[PDB]
């Protein structure tokens, strides 16, 4: 998570962080893709019957 790691429990820190915005959104998208591919790997390897 963006704020919990970077600006943990600090409202003004999140207010400043909001300027960058889409930065950590890209991070979340990349990690979600990684997780989905991780599940797909096992699905591909083991589920051939």
């Amino acid at each position: 998570d963006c704020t919990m790691y970077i600006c943990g429990d600090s409202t003004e820190c999140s207010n400043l962080l909001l300027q960058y915005g889409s930065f950590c959104t890209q991070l979340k998208r990349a990690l979600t893709g990684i997780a989905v591919e991780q599940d797909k790997n096992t699905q591909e390897v083991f589920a051939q019957v």
């Binding site: 998570d1 704020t3 919990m4 429990d9 979340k28 979600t32």
Partner: protein, 48 residues
């Protein structure tokens, strides 16, 4: 909330993440020494 996160108005079926949930403090506290020490001023102003 998920429409807000995905930045659109139509969402297809599935699972979507969002902002985390975090418990806010109920109230506030402050702590400070004990504190035993006291400057000897009762003796000063009772000086004969």
């Amino acid at each position: 909330e998920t429409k807000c996160t995905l930045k659109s108005f139509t969402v297809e079926k599935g699972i979507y993440q969002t902002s985390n949930f975090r418990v806010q403090p109920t109230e506030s506290i402050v702590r400070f020494p004990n504190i035993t020490n006291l400057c000897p001023f009762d003796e000063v102003f009772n000086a004969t």
